[PDB]
Design a protein around this nucleic acid. Structure first.
Lengths: 145, 146
DNA sequence: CTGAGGAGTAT
DNA sequence: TACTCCTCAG
């Protein structure tokens, strides 16, 4: 269970299945978008996220990615737990997070990002949603095509 | 999408994930226990099943395996002769080979080829219908290790 | 699109 | 047993 770069996985490498990512140690969960671990200490820190579709993530062609937290979608408030919490803790720990994007081979490794901040939003249903702003660490290869 | 043996996959070969089976063309669905195709030409025929646990099915030490159909088990309801279930039934008369993968306490073994000998329906206490398929291992194949 | 479906893993 | 940015055939 590694943090940051994973041996033999280059930026721009592609995959067909979420489990391929598991087999290479890029991202362990088969569905959950957020993957994390426990630090020397006690706390959770994120190690990787997958942005397909589903949650209304804001990504385009920039170094910034807005990622939605998990939970609640009968709708209910999201909770600062598990993945969500892991990500928040990654803000202060300032650790690298692997990012995989889904695509219209359905997944690309997009390199390393840092969690700059988070905040909460309110849909019309009235329920709470977390948003995490991640920025791509400078200096890495760009994406093909 | 092949019927019967798949190139380079030997009886007793093991796997950790349902998707490994997909990558090799042994079994395509990621969760659904039954995999099938359309015959020429052409109704549904089963091509592979996965027996883990969950659907209470009978996997003793023999050449015979009783496999439960999918559906109804959330509120219980009759299973339907559709998709996989139907595919299996049609494999009875077509008499085509079916690949069988067993889960294990690497979590999956390729167990070779079987034929669907018959089916029938059962009734749980809930009152709803469940299908059962009797499959028999085609003679002459390697045995399982351990 | 839509969700049925012998998943996968931590908790 | 909870949970979950799955996967693909209808």
């Amino acid at each position: 269970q590694i943090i940051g770069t994973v041996p033999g996985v280059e930026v721009g490498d592609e995959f067909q299945y979420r489990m391929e990512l598991n087999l290479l140690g890029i991202h362990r969960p088969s569905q959950s978008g957020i993957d994390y671990m426990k630090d020397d200490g006690g706390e959770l820190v994120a190690t990787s996220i997958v942005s397909s579709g589903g949650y209304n993530d804001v990504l385009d062609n920039s170094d910034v990615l807005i990622y939605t937290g998990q939970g609640g979608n009968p709708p209910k408030d999201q909770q600062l737990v598990t993945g969500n919490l892991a990500l928040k803790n990654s803000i202060n720990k300032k650790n690298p997070v692997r990012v995989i994007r889904g695509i219209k081979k359905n997944y690309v490794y997009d390199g390393l990002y840092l969690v700059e901040e988070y905040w909460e939003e309110t849909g019309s249903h009235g329920k709470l949603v977390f948003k995490f702003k991640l920025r791509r660490i400078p200096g890495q290869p760009e994406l093909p095509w």
